[PDB]
Amino acid sequence: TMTDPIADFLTRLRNANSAYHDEVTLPHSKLKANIAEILKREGYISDYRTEDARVGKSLVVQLKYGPSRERSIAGLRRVSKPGLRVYAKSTNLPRVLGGLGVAIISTSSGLLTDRQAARQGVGGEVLAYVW
Amino acid sequence: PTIQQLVRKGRRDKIAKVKTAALKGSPQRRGVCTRVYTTTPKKPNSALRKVARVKLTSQVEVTAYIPGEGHNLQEHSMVLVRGGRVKDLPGVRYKIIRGSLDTQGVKNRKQARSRYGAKKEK
Amino acid sequence: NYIERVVSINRVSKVVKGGRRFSFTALVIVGDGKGMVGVGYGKAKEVPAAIAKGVEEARKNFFRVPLIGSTITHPVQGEAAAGVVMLRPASPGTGVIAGGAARAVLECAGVHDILAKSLGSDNAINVVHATVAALKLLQRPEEVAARRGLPIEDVAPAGMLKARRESEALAAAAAREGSA
Amino acid sequence: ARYTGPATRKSRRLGVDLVGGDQSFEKRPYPPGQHGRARIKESEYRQQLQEKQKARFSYGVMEKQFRRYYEEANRQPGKTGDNLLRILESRLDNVVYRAGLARTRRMARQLVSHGHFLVNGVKVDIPSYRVSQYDIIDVKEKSLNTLPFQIARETAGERPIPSWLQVVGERQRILVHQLPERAQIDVPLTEQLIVELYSK
Amino acid sequence: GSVIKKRRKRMSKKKHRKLLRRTRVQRRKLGK
RNA sequence: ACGCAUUAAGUACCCCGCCUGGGGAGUACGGCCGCAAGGCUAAAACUCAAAGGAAUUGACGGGGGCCCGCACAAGCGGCGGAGC
RNA sequence: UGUAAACCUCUUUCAGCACAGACGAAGCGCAAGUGACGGUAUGUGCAGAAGAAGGACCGGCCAACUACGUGCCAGCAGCCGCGGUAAUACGUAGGGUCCGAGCGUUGUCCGGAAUUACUGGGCGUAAAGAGCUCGUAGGUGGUUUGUCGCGUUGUUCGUGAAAACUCA
RNA sequence: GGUGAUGGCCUACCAAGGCGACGACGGGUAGCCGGCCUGAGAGGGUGACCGGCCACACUGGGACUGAGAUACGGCCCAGACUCC
């Protein structure tokens, strides 16, 4: 069957970047919606939208590619997989690339980027490193 | 390997082969030799190296090489043995440290005296 | 005034029905000591000849590096054909920690305080190529802010910006003592 | 165990003025011996060795005690090379040499060895004492009638006094105000290679 | 893949099996 | 590297099996099963400083394709037979 | 060799000779006593270099080289390996590097060794996918609403003996 | 019943239950820890000194006194070992 939705999401983004496709369509979820909102805020994607399909809803993402076809995203990889659930005390909020990359923490306040998560002081589960 | 496998079986380490069995946690041992003689190493190194067949006090018989070029050593001699690997010989592992209880220091050796047990020139 | 290196001298030989027609190689890594870095792989019967081939090669084939006073921005993983390296930034006062190859690379580039570590394929050829892959992979915060449309504030931390303006004022005063 | 060999020897070996008045150095900068003309192999290791070699032979200390000072230096919160150098310059004998009462580094070592100073009310025959800020180094009582030192205090026109020293004493009373810093020191080889060696 | 490896394997197996033929008897009539 | 490349050896997670230098040895001892043949689990002493994978140049081939030389075939006179 | 040598000088540490001489005791005791360490540590004065340096290595790894004697030998070796009279790799000469009151060897443990790879590895041919399936225990799990706060996460008290480690 | 106290800690009686693949039952080794060594870090090794607990006092058991006893320089018994 399938088991890992977040990894499916990230892999498919990686794949569409790999192919230099312009848009992607996925099945829809509230977690995925928060993810696309956060990524829009941080500036990787241009803009998403929630469309529909035969029985279920759907997310549609529109990527971002530099002017000379410079991909906006180097790579990406999930951290907290099923099996090893990778939690964090706020003392060790993992930075990325001197701090230049981005984490995506899920916390009491919802889905917090690494910086805001540190400022608020609280933290919790990890989902991904991004850069 | 999934973490479930790691949990359920483990990570079985290697073990490094502990060399120098006869000494048994000793740096040196005390020896009373059986035979003192000479034997030739492998085909390229054509020579005739000087060896003894010692009964240490770990109760293990061992072939052991004799450095330098001189020996007052024959049967029954009371000597002291230490560790060191000779390339040339098949299973030789132990050397006799010169200047301990029978082994008289080689003569006119004046460079590198600490290892061969030689007093300094006056 | 360009620093030049020798981190590889191997004695190769084609074989003809007669015998062994010997030969030499050389791997040269050039850098002015300021960030300009290039690599040649010369070869001939004469070691001067091979090394000079590699010299002109690297004089052509330079390459620009994200340097900071004396350290790069951030860590990266450089994987090559067979070699792997883990470049990681140091704090000023560290030294150019590497072996022979990557050390020569980063001393040509003048990075005085940085780390690496060889994780496989110890041969200097592919050590160097993984090193160079890492250096090409280094991305500048200016570039990142530019591409994702957010300022260097939202895109980069505070300690780096401290060091940026610090080394910038140091470089301005350096030029003002040099020329002016 | 203080060194004893010729100052000319290491000088001809590595090729630096450290003594100053070495006409044999000027005459024969090449290394000495039977292969004194012969050629030497280059590397990273040889350079990093030569660094500390020159430094610790300049100042008299030994390898292991230099390593102790190094452990303190990288134990500091500052940075290893230059704070090591500040530590290393904080010595008593080197301070008085740069004050210029003494001719040779050996001579400053010997002066502090023989107890010819008198520091804040205690005899200090300590050739490695560490002098922090605001240390009132007076000199002892019998210091007057040392004849070559009389000539020293009278016509001490040798190598100048640096910035962080001064004498405000008719009795040749030398005082610390600040500590040495590398921008103003300007001494031979810098200690980055030393750091890289000791953290090899 | 080369074949020297499998040759050495084959050799070991043959020789042990031949030994077991020549000792087919005594093992049976000893292991009681 | 050979080569895989929507029937992936790439892209990521889930589960499992499995490996940690070669040889000794998948052997010995002990056990389980087996009518027997024998299968499975499965070491050590001791020893070697390598065993090995992919590709290149050369040579070689009682593998091949294309060719030349009194190389053979044809025609002659000899050696090996005796004397010196 | 080598500024080394003497020899013109200077201070003499540290040892040595002799006198002075301790805090440790707001203590104890109601008694004139109370220091094993201890007449040392510490001083103060006298004579004068007078009483003082050795060890391992040198082809590269690993900074430092040449000559002499033997020449398949005796012998060295941590690895490559060195040696069949012309050795910078054997013993010795001079010389030089390293360290220094220690210097080398030995024995074990960690690292290097991403060489049991949670951080941090692999299985087409290099060692490695059970001969293939069903399936128990177990591990893992689609979308959404509501809920408990068990995990997880935040702070505070309690606790983490002292000694340790590190900063001042 | 028993001890300062809960308690198969012991006693006669009722049921037959319990433990185990998350390793019982066995074997080998070994005192534990604050700590010490190494390491970038994790982690690995390890338990000199000092400090805190456990156990031991020729071998094997038992009880006494007593607030409290493995009662080292106490008792009793059986051994083994040395002396009169």
Q: Quick check: C95 and D44 CB within 8 A? A: no
Q: Distance (Å, rounded) from C-alpha C42 to C-alpha C59?
A: 12
Distance in Å from the first CA to the final CA of chain D: 27
CA distances from B96 to B18, B21, B33, B104, D53 (A): 20, 16, 11, 12, 39
User: Structure tokens of B39?
Assistant: 């034997």
User: Structure tokens of D88?
Assistant: 């290393």
Q: Distance (Å, rounded) from C-alpha B98 to C-alpha B85?
A: 16
Q: Is the CB of B46 under 7 A from strand G?
A: yes
B contacts of A83 (beta carbons < 8 Å): 2-4
Indicate contact of D with B: 3+ CB pairs under 8 A.
no
Burial E1-32 (b: 16+ CB within 10 A, else e): eeeeeeeeeeeeeeeeeeeeeeeeeeeeeeee
Spell out which residues of B between 54 and 83 contact strand G, using CB within 7 Å: 67-70, 82-83
D44 close contact with C: CB closer than 8 A: yes
Q: Quick check: A100 and C75 CB within 8 A? A: no
**Residue of chain C whose alpha carbon sits nearest to that of A46:** C148
CB of A62 closer than 8 Å to CB of A48: yes
Positions on chain F within 7 A of a protein C-beta: 1, 10-21, 23-27, 36-38, 45-48, 51-54, 57-59
Q: Distance (Å, rounded) from C-alpha C131 to C-alpha C101?
A: 9
**Where on the phi/psi map is residue C66: left (φ > 0), alpha (ψ -120 to 50), or beta?**
beta
| Best A97, A114, A115, A129 residue to mutate vs chain C (most C CBs within 10 Å) | A97
Alpha helices by DSSP H, listed for chain A, are 5-19, 30-42, 114-120
**Residue of chain C whose alpha carbon sits nearest to that of A68:** C147
Distance in angstroms: CA B59, C1' G22: 62
The correct CATH number of A74-131 out of 3.30.1360.200, 3.30.1490.10, 3.40.50.620, 3.40.50.720 is 3.30.1490.10
What are the residues facing A116 on neighbouring strands?
none
Specify the long-range contacts of residues D56-65, CB closer than 8 Å, at least 24 apart: D57/D3, D57/D10, D57/D18, D58/D18, D58/D105, D58/D188, D59/D88, D59/D91, D59/D94, D59/D105, D60/D2, D60/D3, D60/D93, D60/D105, D60/D106, D60/D109, D60/D127, D61/D88, D61/D128, D62/D1, D65/D128
In the PDB record, what is the listed experimental method?
Answer: cryo-EM
Q: Outline which parts of chain A fall under CATH 3.30.1490.10.
A: 74-131
Instruction: Name the nt closest to A32 by C-alpha to C1'.
Output: G143
User: Structure tokens of C2?
Assistant: 């360009």
A contacts of C147 (beta carbons < 8 Å): 64, 66, 70, 72
| Best C88, C147, C152 residue to mutate vs chain A (most A CBs within 10 Å) | C147
Q: Outline which parts of chain A fall under CATH 3.30.1370.30.
A: 1-73
What are the residues facing B96 on neighbouring strands?
B81
Q: Is the CB of A82 under 7 A from strand F?
A: yes
Fold classified for A1-73: Ribosomal Protein S8; Chain: A, domain 1 (3.30.1370)
CB of D116 closer than 8 Å to CB of D143: yes
A contacts of B2 (beta carbons < 8 Å): 83
Give which of A45, A50, A55, A42 is closest to A103, Cα–Cα: A42
Q: Distance (Å, rounded) from C-alpha A5 to C-alpha A56?
A: 15
CB of C155 closer than 8 Å to CB of C145: yes
Three-class HEC string of A63-85:
CCECCCCCECCCCEEECCCCCCC
Phi, psi angles (nearest 5°) of residue A104: -135, 95
3-state secondary structure of A106: strand
Select from C93, C97, C103 the Cβ nearest to the Cβ of D80. Answer: C93
CB of B80 closer than 8 Å to CB of B28: yes
Neighbouring residues of D136: CB distance < 8 A, sequence distance ≥ 6: D119, D120, D173, D175
User: Structure tokens of D152?
Assistant: 């020293």
Q: Distance (Å, rounded) from C-alpha D18 to C-alpha D23?
A: 12
**Residue of chain D whose alpha carbon sits nearest to that of C92:** D79
Q: Distance (Å, rounded) from C-alpha A53 to C-alpha A47?
A: 19
D46 close contact with C: CB closer than 8 A: no
Instruction: Name the nt closest to B3 by C-alpha to C1'.
Output: G118
Q: Is the CB of D199 under 7 A from strand G?
A: no
What is the experimental resolution, given in Å to one decimal place?
A: 3.5
